[PDB]
Design an enzyme around this catalytic site. Structure first.
Site: not given
Ligand SMILES: [Ca+2]
Length: 240
Positions: A64, A186, A59, A61, A45, A188-189, A69, A93
């Protein structure tokens, strides 16, 4: 994640942020799990919309510079072929994202370990949900990666009438439902990490919470059961 705590930045190195292009910026929309250096596992979805997606590994933050990353484009999206967006309760899903580049592994960026095919957790098994999703029902995304302890709720309980009834399938894992801690929009997944024989493995892909709210007693967070999809995952990676 409602009722979470901030994760340590090297606890959950398989967690990714799935983002879409929004004007001259990027917006976090979903989680995912890095499962090969060039493949992410997420919810179907999360990719129903015709958006431009990227993955962020390393990741912590969203707001910031972490200094860890790696930002990589999504090259190919393979949704489970039985997925229907208007029937999330039917299951399926799950989606795999092939990345444009292979990411480099380090203490912040590692492959998620998946369970053996068919594995079912005992009721009340210890797990953590992780993500940047809302920190309250109808709230706002977290800045820092959150974790919450969500013990499993087995299929017999989860599919009982005071819990999810018929909405939950044996192809799903339920966890939490204490009214305090949960996934939320947010998340999800993203992964559900469960401790088995001394090792965390990703047993779930966050799929849904109740329309009434995120942290609702007897509406545990529902995840796609990764161990039901091992052959499908392997078949997609081998054919792409
Ligand atoms: Ca960051």
């Amino acid at each position: 994640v409602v009722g979470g705590t901030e994760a340590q930045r090297n606890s959950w190195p398989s967690q990714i942020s799935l983002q879409y292009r929004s004007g001259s910026s990027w917006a976090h929309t979903c989680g995912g799990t890095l499962i090969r250096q060039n493949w992410v596992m997420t919810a179907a979805h999360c990719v129903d919309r015709e958006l431009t997606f990227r993955v962020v590994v390393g990741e912590h933050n969203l707001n910031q510079n972490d200094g860890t990353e790696q930002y990589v484009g999504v090259q190919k999206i393979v949704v489970h072929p039985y997925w229907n967006t208007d029937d999330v309760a039917a299951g399926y899903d799950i989606a795999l994202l092939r990345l444009a580049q292979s990411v480099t592994l380090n203490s912040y960026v590692q492959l998620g370990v998946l369970p053996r095919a068919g594995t079912i957790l005992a009721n009340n098994s210890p797990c953590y949900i992780t993500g940047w999703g809302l920190t309250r029902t109808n709230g706002q995304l977290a800045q820092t990666l959150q974790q919450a302890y969500l013990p499993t709720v087995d299929y017999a309980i989860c599919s009982s009438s005071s819990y999810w009834g018929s909405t939950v399938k044996n192809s799903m894992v339920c966890a939490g439902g204490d009214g305090v801690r949960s996934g939320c929009q947010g998340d999800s997944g993203g992964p559900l990490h469960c401790l088995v024989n001394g090792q965390y493995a990703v047993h779930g892909v966050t799929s849904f919470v109740s329309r009434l709210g995120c942290n609702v007693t007897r509406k545990p967070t529902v995840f796609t059961r990764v161990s039901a999809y091992i052959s499908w995952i392997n078949n997609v990676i081998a054919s792409n």
